[PDB]
Ligand binder design. Structure first.
Ligand SMILES: Nc1ccn([C@H]2C[C@H](O)[C@@H](COP(=O)(O)OP(=O)(O)OP(=O)(O)O)O2)c(=O)n1
Ligand SMILES: [Ca+2]
Ligand SMILES: [Ca+2]
Ligand SMILES: [Ca+2]
Ligand SMILES: [Ca+2]
Ligand SMILES: [Ca+2]
Length: 903
DNA sequence: CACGTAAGCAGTCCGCG
DNA sequence: GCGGACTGCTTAC
């Protein structure tokens, strides 16, 4: 095979690299890397090296890496640019792998692990590691085995061996329900003392050295705990065995409110699954415990246990070890679905970066652009300092708060990257400037054409038409990948609905799911076979299609995030190619495009409907428009439609065959106006929205910018079996809104949009009646708890103290001294409940760590003192009041003259 | 060692015969 | 009691 790297590190004048060789074996080597950097030379100097602006440079080959670094310092001291890749492991990889890396993931060792530590005196801090590690489960992707290290003897209790036979039994039978499909894959290793356990773990770790190290909170808990515990028992140098190169750094991550002390293990690439999840999943969760996420992603039940975790090993060691195993499997299960490890490897190798660098769009693009430019013997510019400067972004139209019966939405495909590609925006394609006119003057086609020679943005910038930028070139490659996957996701989504339709009339048969590729639209032949299938076979088909869709989702949306990150990076002061002229070229163009095409659509629709000056476009944000279709419908007459699908068909056909061509014409004119390199403003239909035909449903409503709901029947060519709510910004979408309230608000909305005012009233009445019976957790608010210390004045609230912080302080007072109670962690999330006046907590609210039951010693009083009235008014009524007033209806029957009569 | 801006809502402080 | 200026959190793009 072709060789590829696993890990790369810089250690003094040495590059340390783990790799896979041509025989597909894992290898290491230490390389005395001889780096080059560049300096501008005179034109008379004959060279093959040019900077991005075509100015010649001379190569400086250094005897080592320290020499290269000190030369940089001397160049600074002189006042002259030091060009080339200053991060040497990137140059190294670029030099070593000068070809498209093709990797084999079966050769990459991926470790998934989690440890247990019994702690009678509060949370067991990694930096002290004062308590014994009494369990470790470590899954090795190459062996496909869970290696389990079990401490039988501890200061905190001596226990019997764990039983795999009991582990595998149903919970209802006293066992642990360890999933059967991993039972044969567990290798259980009991130990009479911690030292032999750790010693064994280390030797095992040396035999099977992780390349990708993952797990849940491994970076903040398991890794530093293991390292520090080994350090305290054996010494630092024994702890350093956790690094293939015997090197580690007790690091400092600089977040906005504090700093977490992590351990960098050199020669390992740590991707904590909690971090992958937060970056790649596009959820905002009220809690990030594994229990919570596992239930969310997989629909599995909470691993329940009697008592506290600090007493679980002693009371039920059997269950303790099973849970440690299951927890490790659960990450594998989430990854099997989401495929974030595959994503990271995909992106990491594509970029030629350390795998953990996928967290940084800036590092990723720096590596991509450098590799692209190096191929052409070009020399990247030095990184420079810039002060932080605000700049303008998108345009958002002020909507008229109202109900909106029929709506059709459109937006730009990959808007900012397409603008980059259309205009030819790159650091080295800048041609000059022109004198700007007010934006509205371009929007209305009254301003002078900017240039008949160069490609332009309405921000005043001009670009070359006759040559490609490295930014456009490289952003196009990723965009094209993005497009392939989204095709795969949308087909799987369309296939899913075909399956949901066939589920209305399932056959009574015993059959099997069809072997198909869910990534391509089902053929007529497959559609026919599906109409004959049982419920069981259809339901397994539907599961597979939806997993195929999630996989496409993961792949497309994160490549979209990456290319969008390139547009944003141009406005980040740490980006080698930082430039507010380029950043602003993009956003100002976006504003023009949205408002241009608003005009064109209003003009067009007036024209076809035979009218003048009527406002069709009701709203738009950044690259989208929302078109009221009431008049399109009225023009033909609602009466003429057979059912709901008949008008959805009509509007779909109208958008595709009439509106899109006119939009296309609209944007080609703007392209000529700006004299751009290439027309790439593709504004395709998104949603067709309206009430069920013959219903009292209102179809949709807007409350303000970024706040709206639509009853959608078709989304980007997916014709739903059942209408789906598109809700943006409203409380149902906010992780701070109580779970049960999100759900209740959503049904209120569904009723408004699909059924009408009277249906809404019926539901409101019921929820209001029954809501005091809801589980306290389902009705608690959620908030991040940042800067708790600042507002802590002797255990009490300082000035300007935020409500949720106040609740943490109340919590901290009620649990004072009791070491069993879980502490609130800085920057993590809390559940929040308001308290009736005169409560024994002595304040108006309480807050505890989210995803958890509040500790048993205060639970009782919380449940008794909760302020239901305040909670209903704040989380439910006030937002519902906003929806309904916007929509011009009432959630409660208003008083009237009819009130004088008898029922 | 570091993708972007726009913009809505909850809450605190504070004025107000 | 409710505006208005302000911090803090959060979501649409
Ligand atoms: N997380 C996000 C989402 C949006 N935007 C900017 C860049 C996008 O190009 C633009 C439009 O937002 P979209 O959500 O419509 O994203 P795209 O237009 O890029 O992709 P799609 O083809 O899915 O519409 O907003 C951004 O910078 N970061
Ligand atoms: Ca645990
Ligand atoms: Ca878009
Ligand atoms: Ca059937
Ligand atoms: Ca959009
Ligand atoms: Ca689209």
């Amino acid at each position: 095979m072709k060789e590829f790297y696993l890990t790369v590190e810089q250690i003094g004048d040495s590059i340390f690299e783990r790799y896979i060789d041509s025989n597909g074996r894992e290898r290491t080597r230490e390389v005395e890397y001889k780096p080059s950097l560049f300096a501008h030379c005179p034109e008379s100097q004959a060279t093959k090296y040019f900077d991005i602006y075509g100015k010649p440079c001379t190569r400086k080959l250094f005897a080592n890496m320290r020499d290269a670094s000190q030369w940089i310092k001397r160049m600074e001291d002189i006042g002259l640019e030091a060009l080339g890749m200053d991060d040497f492991k990137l140059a190294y990889l670029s030099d070593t792998y000068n070809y498209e890396i093709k990797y084999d993931h079966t050769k990459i060792r991926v470790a998934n692990f989690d440890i247990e530590v019994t702690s009678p005196d509060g949370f067991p801090e990694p930096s002290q590691a004062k308590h014994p590690i009494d369990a470790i489960t470590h899954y090795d992707s190459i062996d496909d085995r869970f290696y389990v290290f079990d401490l039988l003897n501890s200061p905190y209790g001596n226990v019997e061996e764990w039983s795999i036979e009991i582990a595998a039994k149903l919970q209802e039978q006293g066992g642990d329900e360890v999933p059967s499909e991993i039972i044969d894959k567990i290798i259980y290793m009991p130990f009479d003392n911690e030292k032999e356990l750790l010693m064994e773990y280390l030797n095992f770790w040396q035999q099977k050295t992780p390349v990708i190290l993952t797990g849940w909170n491994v970076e903040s808990f398991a890794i530093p705990y293991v390292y520090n515990r080994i350090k305290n028992i054996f010494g630092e140098s024994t702890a350093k065995r956790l690094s293939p190169h015997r090197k580690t750094r007790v690091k400092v991550i600089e977040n906005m409110y504090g700093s977490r002390e992590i351990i960098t293990l050199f020669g390992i690439s740590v991707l904590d699954y909690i971090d992958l999840y937060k970056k790649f999943s596009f959820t905002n969760q009220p809690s990030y415990s594994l229990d919570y996420i596992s239930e969310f992603e997989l629909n599995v039940g909470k691993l329940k246990y009697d008592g506290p975790i600090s007493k679980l090993r002693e009371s039920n060691h059997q269950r303790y070890i099973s849970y440690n195993i299951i927890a490790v499997y659960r990450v594998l299960q989430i990854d099997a679905k989401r495929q974030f490890i595959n994503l990271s490897l995909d992106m990491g190798y594509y970029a030629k970066i350390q795998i953990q660098s996928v967290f940084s769009p800036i590092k990723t693009w720096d590596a991509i652009i450098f590799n692209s430019l190096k191929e052409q013997n070009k020399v990247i510019p030095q990184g420079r300092s810039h002060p932080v400067q605000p700049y303008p972004g998108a345009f958002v139209k002020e909507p008229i708060p109202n109900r909106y019966k029929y709506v059709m939405s459109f937006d730009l495909t990959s808007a900012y990257p397409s603008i980059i590609r259309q205009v030819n925006i790159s650091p080295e394609t800048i041609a000059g400037t022109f004198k700007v006119a007010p934006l509205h003057d371009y929007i209305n086609a009254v301003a002078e054409r900017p240039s008949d020679v160069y490609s332009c943005s309405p921000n005043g910038m001009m670009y070359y038409k006759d040559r490609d930028g490295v930014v456009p070139t490289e952003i196009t490659k990723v965009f094209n990948q993005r497009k392939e996957h989204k095709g795969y996701m949308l087909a799987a989504q369309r296939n899913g609905e075909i399956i949901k339709e066939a589920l209305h009339n399932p056959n009574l048969s015993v059959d099997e799911p069809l072997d198909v590729d869910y990534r391509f639209d089902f053929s007529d032949e497959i559609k026919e076979k599906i109409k004959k299938l049982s419920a069981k076979s259809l339901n397994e088909m539907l599961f597979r299609a939806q997993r195929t869709e999630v996989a496409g989702m993961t792949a497309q949306i994160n490549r979209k995030a990456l290319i969008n990150g390139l547009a944003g990076a141009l406005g980040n002061v740490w980006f080698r190619y930082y430039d507010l002229r380029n950043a602003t070229a993009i956003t100002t163009f976006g504003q023009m495009a949205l408002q241009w095409i608003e005009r064109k659509v209003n003009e067009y629709l007036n024209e076809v409907c035979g009218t003048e000056g009527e406002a069709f476009v009701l709203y738009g944000d950044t690259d989208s428009i929302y078109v009221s279709a009431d008049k399109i419908i009225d023009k033909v007459g609602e009466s003429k439609f057979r059912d709901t699908n008949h008008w959805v068909d009509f509007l779909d056909k109208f958008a595709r065959e009439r509106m899109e061509p006119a939009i296309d014409r609209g944007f080609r004119e703007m392209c000529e106006y700006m004299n751009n390199k290439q027309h790439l403003m593709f504004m395709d239909r998104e949603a067709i929205a309206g009430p069920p035909l013959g219903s009292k449903g209102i179809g949709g409503f807007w409350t303000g910018k970024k706040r709206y709901a639509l009853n959608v029947w078709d989304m980007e060519g997916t014709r739903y079996a059942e209408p789906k709510l598109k809700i943006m910004g409203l409380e149902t979408q906010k992780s701070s809104t109580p779970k049960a309230v999100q759900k209740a608000l959503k049904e209120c909305i569904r009723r408004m949009l699909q059924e009408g005012e009277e249906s809404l009233q019926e539901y409101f009445k019921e929820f209001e009646k029954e809501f005091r019976q809801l589980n306290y957790i389902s009705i608690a608010s959620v908030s991040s708890a940042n800067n708790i210390a600042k507002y802590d004045v002797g255990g009490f609230p300082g000035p300007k103290c935020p409500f949720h912080i106040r609740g943490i302080l109340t919590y901290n007072r009620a649990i004072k001294g009791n070491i069993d109670a879980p502490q609130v962690v800085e920057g993590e999330k809390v559940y929040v409940l308001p308290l009736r006046e005169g409560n024994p907590f002595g304040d108006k609210c309480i807050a505890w760590p989210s995803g958890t039951e509040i500790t048993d010693l205060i639970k009782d009083d919380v449940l008794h003192w909760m302020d239901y009235t305040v909670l209903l008014e704040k989380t439910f009524i006030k937002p519902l009041e906003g929806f309904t007033s916007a929509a011009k209806l009432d959630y409660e029957k208003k008083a009237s003259l009819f009130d004088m009569f008898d029922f």
